Amino acid sequence: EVKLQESGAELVKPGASVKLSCKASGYTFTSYWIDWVKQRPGQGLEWIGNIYPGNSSTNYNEKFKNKATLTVDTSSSTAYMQLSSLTSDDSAVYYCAREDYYDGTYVYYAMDFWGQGTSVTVSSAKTTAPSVYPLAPVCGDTSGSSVTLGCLVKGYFPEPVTLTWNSGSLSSGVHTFPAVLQSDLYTLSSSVTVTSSTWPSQSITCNVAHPASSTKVDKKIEPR
Amino acid sequence: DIVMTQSQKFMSTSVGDRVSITCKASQNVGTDVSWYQQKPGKSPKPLIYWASNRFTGVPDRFTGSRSGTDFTLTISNVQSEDLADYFCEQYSSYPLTFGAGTKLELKRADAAPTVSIFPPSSEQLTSGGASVVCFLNNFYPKDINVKWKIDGSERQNGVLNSWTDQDSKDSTYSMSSTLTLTKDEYERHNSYTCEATHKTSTSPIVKSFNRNE
Amino acid sequence: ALVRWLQESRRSRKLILFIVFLALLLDNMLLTVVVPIIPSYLLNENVQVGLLFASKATVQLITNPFIGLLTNRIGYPIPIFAGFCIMFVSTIMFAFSSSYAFLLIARSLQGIGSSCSSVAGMGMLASVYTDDEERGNVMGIALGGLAMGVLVGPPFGSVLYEFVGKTAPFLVLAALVLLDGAIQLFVLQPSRVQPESQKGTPLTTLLKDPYILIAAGSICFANMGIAMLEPALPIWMMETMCSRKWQLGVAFLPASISYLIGTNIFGILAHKMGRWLCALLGMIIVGVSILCIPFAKNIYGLIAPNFGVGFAIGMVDSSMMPIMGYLVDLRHVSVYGSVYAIADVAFCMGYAIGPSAGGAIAKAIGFPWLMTIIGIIDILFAPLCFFLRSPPAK
Ligand SMILES: COc1cc2c(cc1OC)[C@H]1CC(=O)[C@@H](CC(C)C)CN1CC2
């Protein structure tokens, strides 16, 4: 079966070059065009270029002539694209796709198989462990039969982080928001809603796990 | 460079309803437009090729049409599986142009945010910074405005906003707004307020707390 | 233009249209290139010439249904390639033929190849162009190739025959066929059998459709007037001397130019106003031109009618080639292999039965009273194209 395997994520410095790869397998590699597309978060897709692996004949978008150079490796059946002088605005998700011919001809009609994206990120911050803070409801102010709690994590640069409540057992009203970026450091927060007779009685702990740095902190929310 | 315009970036339809996504080219592209669909957390898959024809595995609901320079993708029985991003394509000229994208979302009865405000914890104060957090949960219409009042001064800087995608169980939304300050500035003011303006209430929903309460 | 521009580019489905245009152009350039060479080869001198118009058309008409059924189980590229593979052999046979029987054999082989190319090329321009307006435009452009071939054939053949020998008109025509074959190999894949996904309507169900019978009858009758005139012309009966080169070189310029102009204009003008209207007004013009033909004192009197009729014929074709695919889409299963075999049989029936039936009738009553009958038949058939304004659906 056709498959275009791609790297999960790439981290680059504000001055550097990155060589994205898209490994093609499941078909004769040297007979189909491979396209590269770029999708910034929250905007449209932008074509980058084509390469024909058999001839190594390429096409580029005029906007991307000086940035992305596509190349191929027939022996190992891989398609490379090198981005040079990476800065911000160059932190999109890059896709590698395969062009197909209409059955019985060489007329292109669609791009069948797209590889999974490669989330290129540009930032100079080093790896830092997050700081976990137990947000608790305001002192007094006993209103209603429902109480919402939360925990807030600030300062971790490497993107992945896993937040769980009561070691994943409590998922009645959890809400974990997407991590946001500020001053080259990330911030995330999460909240859980419970009954008025649960939190003052049964303890709730926010567990934060960071894969990049070996840190695992459990914070117990307490009344003010 | 032919510009493929997709007017609406967010479309809301209930299950079992007809929907239509429109794309408009600038130059004349003669049935050289393909419609792609990308499901949440997946790579895009082709739906329509040559602006009328349907891919091999696409169901019967999807139909593509052209009316000059205006192209349309129509879904007859919108199902729970047809909640994804849809974009155009063009290859008449060589610089390829894709549509901006249209995302399909479910529709439900309107709700009201459950605004809650959390003052900075002890550990933040010991470290040397203060964060005030405001959670606005369970409101359907995705448009909501949030304002922060530091003793009525309407602070603007240092505000971070995170928006959740539409919930799978409830089809409702959520938002988190964080205001960060130095330790000294937080100890200076007295009262803090997080207020929201939404389609379900003319009067803003306010949650306020006092520093020395 | 640039050799590199083809290498680094998406193939834009206009290469299929280019291939169809080129195949039609070469098939019709080989068809008419023998006109300046027939009088060198000589029953009556207009019966032998009648057997040269009919030998190819009869075999093409017989073969068309088989290709229509075959493209369903094999696909179009293999018959399209077979068209070239038979055209080349026909050209080689023509260049090395030393009698009349060999001329007839080469004509029949060329008819087989032409049927393959035409049925598998018209029916593929419809499978990739499923838009109504685009299909009309591309079929008008493709039918322009027929007129271009008829225009270019006789003069180029006559020039090469008078200047650089008798085998030259075909030894410089095999090279162009070779180039067309190379282009086809570049675009198509004639090495793989690609059966169609769905089985189309039987040939005995399309033929029961009134709206397909009308569209085929328009094309069949539009060509019935010019098919009975060309075999019976004064130019054939005389030798290739006494200023007969000029009459054989420029004989078919007016009809070809008119066909080219009409088809090119109305491929795009057949949708602004209905295709039914183009066919309706394209069948009264044929009637009037055929009626005016037998009032010609000399050969020059056939210059002006042969203009008008040609133009009219173009309109009809350029209006009723897309309508077959449109009707098979609207009322039947979308498989165009066997709905264009009907169109090709209708087109070629006139030339199949012209030089014989028209000759017998003209012997029975006379030529003016044959052209009058053909013209009245066309005018009377014209109103039946009103039934293509809004045909029902499934
Ligand atoms: C020597 O053999 C043939 C020679 C010629 C013809 C047919 C032959 O044999 C079948 C027909 C062919 C057409 O299709 C007509 C097209 C015009 C109306 C544009 C005209 N004419 C050209 C000469």
Spatial CB neighbours of B60, under 8 Å, sequence gap ≥ 6 = B76
How many Cβ pairs within 8 Å bridge chains A and C?
40
Question: Is the Cβ–Cβ distance between C120 and C73 less than 8 Å?
Answer: no
Distance C54 CA to ligand 1 centre (A): 11
Same domain? For A72 and A141 the reply is no
Taking a C-beta distance cutoff of 8 angstroms, is the pair C308, C296 a contact?
no
Q: Residue ranges of the domains in chain B?
A: 10-105, 114-210
What are residue C317's phi and psi, to 5 degrees?
-60, -50
- DSSP 3-state assignment of B207? strand
Query: How far is CA B156 from each of CA B35, B159, B174, B179, rounded to the nearest angstrom?
Result: 41, 7, 21, 9
C234 φ/ψ angles, rounded to the nearest 5 degrees: -65, -20
Q: Is C150 annotated as a binding residue?
A: yes
Beta carbons of B181 and B106 less than 8 angstroms apart: no
The helix/strand/coil state of A5 is strand
Q: List phi, psi (to 5°) of A133.
A: -130, 130
Single out the residue of C140, C135, C105 nearest to residue C24, CA to CA: C140
| Number of structural domains chain A divides into | 2
A-B interface: how many C-beta pairs under 8 angstroms? 109
Sequence-ordered list of residues with C-beta below 8 angstroms from that of B35, at least 6 positions apart, any chain? B21, B23, B46, B47, B48, B51, B62, B64, B71, B73, B86, B87, B88, B89
Token reading at B50: 């040559």
Task: Tell me the C-alpha distance between C167 and B16, whole Å.
Answer: 72
* Measured torsion, CA atoms of residues B73, B77, B81, B85, in degrees rounded to the nearest 10: 20
Under an 8 A CB cutoff, do A138 and B50 touch? no
Cβ-Cβ contacts under 8 Å for B200 (sequence gap 6 or more): B110, B111, B112, B139, B141
* Residues A212/A9, Cβ–Cβ less than 8 Å: no
Question: Would you state the structure tokens that stand for residue C354, as one six-digit string?
Answer: 């012209």
Ligand 1 center to C48 CA (angstroms): 16
Round to whole Å and give the CA distance between A90 and A20.
13
Give the architecture (CATH level 2) of B10-105.
Answer: Sandwich (2.60)
How many other C-beta atoms are found inside a 10 Å radius of the C-beta of residue B147? 16
Question: Does A134 contact B100 at a Cβ distance shorter than 8 Å?
Answer: no
* CA–CA distances in Å: residue C280 to residues A102, C269, C319, C387: 38, 14, 10, 10
**Residues of chain C found within 8 Å of residue A105, distances taken between Cβ atoms:** 11, 16, 77, 187-189
Q: Which residues of B106-125 are buried (b: 16+ CB within 10 A; e: fewer)?
A: beeeebebbbbbbbbbeebe
Question: How far from the centroid of its chain's Cα atoms is residue B11's Cα?
Answer: 10
Same domain for A54 and A110?
yes
Residues B145, B166: Cα–Cα separation, whole Å: 17
Do residues A7 and A118 share a domain?
yes
Sort strands B10-12 and B102-105 into parallel, antiparallel or unpaired: parallel
Does residue B95 sit at the A interface (CB-CB below 8 Å)? yes
Q: Does C239 touch chain B (CB under 8 A)?
A: no
From C9, C10, C131, residue closest to B31, measured CB to CB: C131
Contact predicate B131/B179, CB 8 Å: yes
The answer to whether C292 and C284 are in contact (CB under 8 A) is no
Ligand 1 pocket, residue C315 CB under 6 Å: no
Experimental method: cryo-EM
Cβ of C148 below 6 Å from ligand 1 = no
Tell me chain C's radius of gyration from C-alpha atoms: 20
- DSSP structural state of residue B164: P
| Helix H or strand E segment including C50 | helix C50-74
Which CATH number goes with the domain that contains C31? 1.20.1250.20
State the resolution, in angstroms. 3.2
Task: Give the SS3 label for residue A110.
Answer: strand
Buried b (16+ CB within 10 A) or exposed e, B27-51: eebbbbbbbbbbeeeebbbbbbbbb
How distant, in Å, are the alpha carbons of B124, B157, B184, B196, C264 from that of B180? 11, 9, 12, 18, 72
Q: Are residues A115 and A10 in the same domain?
A: yes
CA distance, residue B94 to nearest chain C CA (Å): 8
- Give the pair of three-digit tokens for residue B134: 């405001």
Cβ contacts (< 8 Å) between B94 and chain A: which residues?
59
Residues A99 and A171 in one domain: no
User: Atom of ligand 1 at shortest distance to CA of C310?
Assistant: 18
Q: Quickly list DSSP for A113-165.
A: EEPPPEEEEE--------EEE---PPSS---SSEEEEEEEEE---SS--EEEE
Contacting residues of B for A44, CB less than 8 Å apart: 87, 98-101
Fold agreement between B10-105 and B114-210 = yes
**What whole-number distance in Å separates Cα of residue B140 and Cα of residue C304?**
76
C255 lines ligand 1 (CB under 6 A): yes
- For C189, the closest of A50, A57, A105 (CB atoms) is A105
Q: Is C53 in the pocket of ligand 1 (CB under 6 A)?
A: yes
Residue A131 near residue A152 (C-beta atoms within 8 A): no
For C197, the closest chain B residue by CA position comes to B56
Please give the C-alpha separations between residue C56 and each of B67, C15, C80, C87, C330, in angstroms, as whole numbers.
43, 28, 18, 13, 34
SS3 (DSSP) at B179: strand
For residue C351, say whether it is annotated as part of any ligand binding site.
yes
**A77 and A102, same domain (yes or no):** yes
* Buried b or exposed e, range B163-184, using 16+ CB within 10 angstroms: eeebbeeebbbbbbbbbbbeee
Annotated ligand binding at C317? The verdict is yes
Q: Find out whether the beta carbon of C49 lies less than 6 Å from any atom of ligand 1.
A: no
Q: Is residue C2 part of a domain?
A: no
In 3D space, the residue among C364, C390, C375, C354 whose CA is nearest the CA of residue C53 turns out to be C354
Q: How far apart are CA A13 and CA C60, in angstroms?
A: 71
CB distance A96 to A34 below 8 Å: yes
Q: d(Cα C381, Cα C216) in Å, to the nearest integer?
A: 12
Beta strands in chain A (DSSP E): 3-6, 9-12, 18-25, 34-39, 45-52, 57-60, 68-73, 78-83, 93-101, 108-114, 118-122, 131-133, 146-154, 162-165, 175-176, 180-182, 185-195, 205-210, 215-220
| Residue A21 and residue A107 share a domain | yes
CA–CA dist B148, B197 (Å, integer): 12
Q: How far is the CA of C153 from the centre of ligand 1 (A)?
A: 10
Comparing CB atoms, the residue among A45, A139, A175 nearest residue B137 is A175
Q: Domain range for residue C265?
A: 11-388
- Range(s) of the domain holding residue A135: 131-220
Give the residue from A122, A143, A162 where a domain finishes: A122
Which residues in C lie closer than 8 A to residue A104 (C-beta atoms)? 75-77, 188-189, 192, 194
Name chain B's partners: 3 or more CB pairs within 8 A.
A, C
Number of domains making up chain C: 1
Nearest C-alpha to atom 8 of ligand 1 is from which residue? Answer: C53
- Phi, psi of A164, deg, nearest 5: -135, 155
**What is the gyration radius of the CA atoms in chain A, in angstroms?**
24
* Mutation choice for B interface testing from A35, A45, A186, A206 by most B CBs within 10 A: A45
DSSP conformation class of C356: I
Three-class DSSP labels, B5-65? ECCCCEEECCCCCCEEEEEECCCCCCCCCCEEEECCCCCCEEEEECCCEECCCCCCCEEEE
Q: Classify B114-210 by CATH class.
A: mainly beta
Total residue count of chain C as it appears in this document:
394
Ligand 1 pocket residue status of C236, Cβ below 6 Å: no
DSSP state of C295: G
Q: What is the DSSP letter of C382?
A: G
The CATH number assigned to the domain holding A29 equals: 2.60.40.10
B78 Cβ contact partners less than 8 Å away, ≥ 6 residues apart: B13, B14, B15, B16, B17, B18, B19, B61, B104
Are A147 and A72 in a shared domain?
no
Could you say which of A122, A142, A174 is where a domain stops? A122
- Across the B/C interface, how many CB contacts are shorter than 8 Å? 19
User: Quick one: which H or E segment has residue C153?
Assistant: helix C132-164
Residue C259, annotated as binding a ligand: yes
Ligand 1 binding pocket includes C57 (Cβ within 6 Å): yes
CA distances from C149 to A6, C24, C25, C144 (A): 53, 8, 5, 9
In chain B, residues with a C-beta closer than 8 Å to the C-beta of A42 are none
d(CA A174, CA A190): 7
C171 among annotated binding-site residues: no
Which residue owns the Cα nearest ligand 1 atom 9? C53
Residues of A within 8 A of B44 (CB-CB) are 95, 114
DSSP type of residue C242:
S
| Bridge partner list, B115 | B136
Cα–Cα distance, A70 to A57 (Å, whole number): 10
Q: Answer whether C156 contacts ligand 1 (Cβ < 6 A).
A: no
Distance CA C390, CA C19 (A): 33
C92 belongs to a structural domain: yes
Closest residue by Cα to residue C57 from C98, C132, C115, C105? C115
Element (H, E) at C392: none
How far is residue C249 CA from its own chain's centroid?
20
For residue C338, being part of any structural domain is answered with yes
Subunits close to A (at least 3 CB pairs below 8 A):
B, C
Spell out which residues of chain C touch residue A57, defining contact as CB-CB under 8 Å: 7-8
What's the gap in Å between C337 CA and the centre of ligand 1? 25
Q: Which residues of C346-369 are buried (b: 16+ CB within 10 A; e: fewer)?
A: bbbbbbbbbbbebbebbeeeebee
